[PDB]
Each structure stands twice: as structure tokens, then as C-alpha cells.
Amino acid sequence: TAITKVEREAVLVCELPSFDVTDVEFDLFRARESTDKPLDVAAAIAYRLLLGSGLPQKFGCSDEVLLNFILQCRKKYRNVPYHNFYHVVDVCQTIHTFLYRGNVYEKLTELECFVLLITALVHDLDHMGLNNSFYLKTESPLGILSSASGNTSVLEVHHCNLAVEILSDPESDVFDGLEGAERTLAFRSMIDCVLATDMAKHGSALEAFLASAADQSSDEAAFHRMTMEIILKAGDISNVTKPFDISRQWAMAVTEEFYRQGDMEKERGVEVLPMFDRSKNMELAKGQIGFIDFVAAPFFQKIVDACLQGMQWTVDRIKSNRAQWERVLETR
Ligand SMILES: [Mg+2]
Ligand SMILES: [Zn+2]
């Protein structure tokens, strides 16, 4: 279904007036509420980041093809509290700051940077606010399909499929200007990055990245790839690296998705983890502190110590968000 000229022009008119999209403290929530067309603003942020980078022009992607691509991604995100178009635009923006303020561009080629920024926008296509466990535990059609076809990353495979479908049309194929090994690397690296977002693979992905970083004779291609996976992973859990108020808003939104899954799980007669249980009302702060201590702090501290020195601010910001959550608890 082609993109109208009207859909494009609506995005193209957006000014972005009091906003620096390149900055680590960019506030997507304030961008949304400053317009009655927040979905067009979101699209314009992605469009301007991408064009502003110089990367699409280097790889033969025209302005029009880029914008069509962004709009075809947008059509496939749903009206869910968290895993929506704003999330992926946020991940794109955040990865941009990791590459260009955190200087991770030093570890990757320009092609890999372009692929990562594009991959951010496809990485949760058609998410329905339900995680992989829901599908496997309820024996839903997608769960059965995954089980029968091998791979337990139900959603990530689904997202890759839709990404491939979008890119198979030349009018939205941001990789159309590539050929041969470069076009293959684009698709293979996109898919690997998206598959690496499944949190069941978190420890394995991290170990593999760290082992590959410690090894000076690492297969360069595989180290580059690992770096891409880790950067998409970092963007995906980057809410805790943001100014506290921004971090808190994302945490409220994800929590609402967890509760809606738990409602759906209860009414299907399946097991509900207490974090998903609306009626066993839980403290936002303990959940954030839990995530920080067991997942995010070691992840970001390790990748920074191992090789990504320029992303030091992420560790500092996690440390200060954690302390703030700890004071929310201490004063209750
Ligand atoms: Mg995902
Ligand atoms: Zn995501």
C-alpha cells in the first residue's frame, strides 16, 4: 500500500522548533505533547536524524525512499502503551547519541551505523504489548509456529519478517543503493540485531561481546556485528540512562503493558508473574532498582569498561537514577 504525497507532506511541514534531536537529554515526551500531530513529529524526528547524518545519501537512499520507509514502519506500530512508534524513534535517537556523542562510530563502518539507525525503526514492528512468554504459555498460533519451526524468539522473528516485507518494495527499500556483499551485510546484520533483542539471550549476547572485545584476533566482521547487536540492545534498555523524569515516564508505560498482559493471562487461566499482576500492586521504584541492579548497571558498566569508554555517561546516569529511586523508597 503506497504512501500518499499527503502523508509525506504532513511529516515534511513539522518544524521541530525548540528541539535538539542529537542531544543525550532530548525529551521525546515534550516533543509529543507540543503538537496535536505527535505521530508526524515522531516521524519527522527520525527523518531529520537520518538525513542529518549524511548516511542515506552516502548509500544511494533518496529522501523520498527514506521517508516512505519511515512511514511504512509507522503504519505497522500499534496503539499500545510502550512498544509503539515512539519507542522505536526513541531507540533510533538514543543509538544516534551512542554513536556520535559516545563515539561508538569509531568501532563501526558508516554502513553499519546506517544499518543500526534503520534497524532501530523496524526492531519491534507490529508489537502487541505481549512478550514471548505469553505466546508460548498460551499455545497461541504464533507460539505454536515458533515451537514447530525451531526458534523461541517469537516476536523478534515476527519483526524481522515485517522488516523484510517493507524492504522488498523498492520505493521503501533504504538498502536499494547497495549491492553484492554490502547489501547482504545490511540484511544479515539487521536481522542479527533484531534477533539479539530477545531478553532470553541477554547474558549470551553480553558474554559473546565481552569475549570478542578481549580478543585482539577477533574475527573483525563478527566483532563489528557483536558491537551492532550490543548497541541495539543498549538502545532498547536505554530508558534507565535518561534524565529521571523521562526514565520514569517510560517505566510507567512499560508497567501498564505488563499489567494488561497479566489481565489477559489471568482470563486465559495461565500463570502470571507478580510483576505482571495489577491486583498485587507493586512499587515502580523496586522494579526499576531491580532491573538496574541485575540487568542494566552491569551491562552498561561492562560494555563501557570493555571497549565503549565514550558511553561513560550512561553508567553515571544509571547510578543517579537508581539513587533517586532509592530515595523514593526511603521517604515512603
Ligand atoms: Mg522487542
Ligand atoms: Zn524495543
From TrEMBL:
Zn(2+) binds at residues 87, 123-124, 236. Zn(2+) 1 binds at residues 87, 123-124, 236. The active site is at residue 83. Zn(2+) 2 binds at residue 124. AMP binds at residues 83-87, 124, 236, 288. Keywords: cGMP, Hydrolase, Metal-binding, Zinc. GO terms for biological process: cell morphogenesis; signal transduction. Residues 4-332 form the PDEase domain. The keyword Metal-binding applies. GO terms for molecular function: 3',5'-cyclic-AMP phosphodiesterase activity; 3',5'-cyclic-nucleotide phosphodiesterase activity; metal ion binding. Mg(2+) 2 binds at residues 124, 156. GO terms for cellular component: axoneme; cytoplasm. It comes from the Eukaryota. Mg(2+) 1 binds at residue 124. Belongs to the cyclic nucleotide phosphodiesterase family. This is Phosphodiesterase. It comes from Trypanosoma brucei. The gene is PDEB1. The chain holds residues 587 to 918 of 930 of the full protein.
